[PDB]
Write a structure and sequence with these properties.
Layout: E1 2-7, H1 11-28, E2 31-36, H2 46-52, E3 59-64, H3 68-73, H4 92-96, E4 99-100, E5 103-104, E6 107-113, E7 115-119, H5 130-140, E8 142-143, H6 149-158, E9 162-167, E10 170-177, H7 181-195, H8 206-214, E11 220-223, H9 228-233, E12 238-241, E13 255-263, H10 270-280, H11 283-293, E14 296-297, H12 300-303, H13 306-309, H14 312-320, E15 325-326, H15 332-339, H16 342-348, H17 353-365
Parallel strand pairs: 1-2, 1-3, 8-11, 13-15
Antiparallel strand pairs: 3-13, 4-5, 6-13, 6-14, 7-11, 7-12, 9-10
Bound molecules: a molecule of 3 linked components (GLC-GLC-GLC).
């Protein structure tokens, strides 16, 4: 009959997913419907919302790995069949990212590490140290999704903060590091980018920063390959560079995100589903996704290809990978995303960095 795929990746990559799915259907006979969920107001967790009522898709494509802890815990994901995944074809952290309680629940398709996207017309040579960064930010502007933990964690970790303690590949949900002296130092710098450097105002966010960058108004912003298409469409002669070292001289620690594909536990055609997932996540598929958006392949063999090794996106990626922190995928991580709004209060000056940190962790525990 028909197999439904929900994709949280849009633009050129979605076009490729549709092309691959159509080629798959040509051989298998099953009609494949690909739905774009990238703009769904319910976000990534909409999968759980839908699956909980038995209205989910057969296959999910383009889901950031942190979300799967919830889905797996609630029994909404079919475990990856034996053999489908060869752990040796990926970096260690990539496979750990798709395991929940030791079980592999999804297939890695891409790896992501946020970086600074800059306009070469304004910033010919990218900054690498905080001092150089200040000079370029002052001269041509800097903005980003400042109150979004996904991005500002780069500063938190750079100062020694952390979400959940990672000891022996196992995260400890009870050991939170978002209220430590280091984390407070980071929150203070976040506030300072508004109150001291004046690069942003309390209202500045990701949407505004992207719009400003596409208009050629700011020389730098923090983003990822999901913006490649729009940046090129805006005809910006862009470059990609790692986060600069911070005021403490340490490297920023952006999160490592693994984009995944998986199968609904309730799907009636799971064998066919996994075959489709394999087609959507093959070396060739990843080559296509990279070609059209610069999304870094999860497969090491594709990363080692000439097109990838020579790209600016990959260069920034390999220069930050050792400092990147895999996002926690346990269910409790959603409570963290849900409480990060307090970062906005700190950045606005409504609450001190010290008090805000305390409230952040308390709101997370809740
Ligand atoms: O902000 C909370 C949010 O953080 C993490 O999400 C990030 C994604 O992991 C990352 O890929 C990127 O999301 C982009 C989608 O991949 C892309 O297809 C398209 O939809 O645009 C998105 C950005 O607008 O950035 C987000 C952070 O904004 C984490 O994985 C989420 O579960 C969490 O809710």
């Amino acid at each position: 009959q028909t197999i439904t795929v929900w994709s949280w990746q849009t633009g050129p990559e979605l076009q490729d997913v549709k092309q691959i799915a159509a080629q798959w259907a040509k051989a298998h006979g099953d009609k494949v419907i690909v739905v774009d969920q990238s703009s769904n107001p319910k976000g990534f967790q909409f999968y759980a919302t839908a699956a909980r009522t038995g209205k989910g898709p057969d296959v999910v494509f383009g889901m950031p790995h942190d979300n799967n802890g919830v889905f797996a815990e609630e029994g909404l994901m079919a475990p990856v069949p034996s053999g489908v995944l060869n752990t040796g074809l990926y970096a260690p952290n990539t496979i750990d990212a798709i395991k929940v309680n030791g079980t592999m629940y999804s297939v890695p398709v891409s790896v992501q590490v946020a970086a600074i996207y800059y306009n070469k017309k304004l910033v010919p040579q990218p900054p690498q140290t905080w001092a150089e960064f200040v000079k370029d930010a002052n001269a041509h502007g800097f903005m980003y999704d400042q109150a979004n933990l996904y991005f500002d964690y780069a500063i938190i970790g750079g100062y020694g903060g952390y979400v959940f303690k990672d000891n022996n590949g196992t995260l400890d949900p009870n050991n939170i590091g978002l209220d430590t002296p280091g984390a407070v130092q980071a929150y203070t710098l976040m506030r300072d980018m508004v109150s001291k450097y004046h690069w942003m105002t309390p209202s500045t966010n990701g949407s505004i920063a992207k719009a400003e960058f596409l208009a050629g108004k700011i020389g730098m912003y923090v983003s990822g390959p999901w913006d490649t298409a729009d940046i090129e469409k805006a005809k910006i002669d862009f470059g990609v560079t790692p986060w600069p070292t911070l005021p403490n001289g340490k490297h920023a620690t952006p999160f490592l995100g693994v984009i995944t594909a998986f199968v609904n536990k309730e799907s009636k055609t799971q064998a066919a589903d996994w075959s489709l997932v394999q087609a959507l996540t093959s070396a060739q598929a990843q080559q296509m996704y990279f070609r059209d958006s610069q999304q870094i392949p999860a497969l090491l063999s594709v990363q080692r290809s000439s097109a990838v090794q020579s790209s600016p996106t990959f260069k920034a990626f390999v220069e930050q990978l050792r400092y990147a922190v895999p996002m926690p995928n346990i269910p409790q991580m959603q409570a963290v995303w849900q409480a990060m709004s307090i970062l906005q209060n700190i950045i606005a000056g409504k609450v001190s960095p010290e008090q805000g940190a305390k409230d952040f962790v308390q709101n997370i525990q809740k």
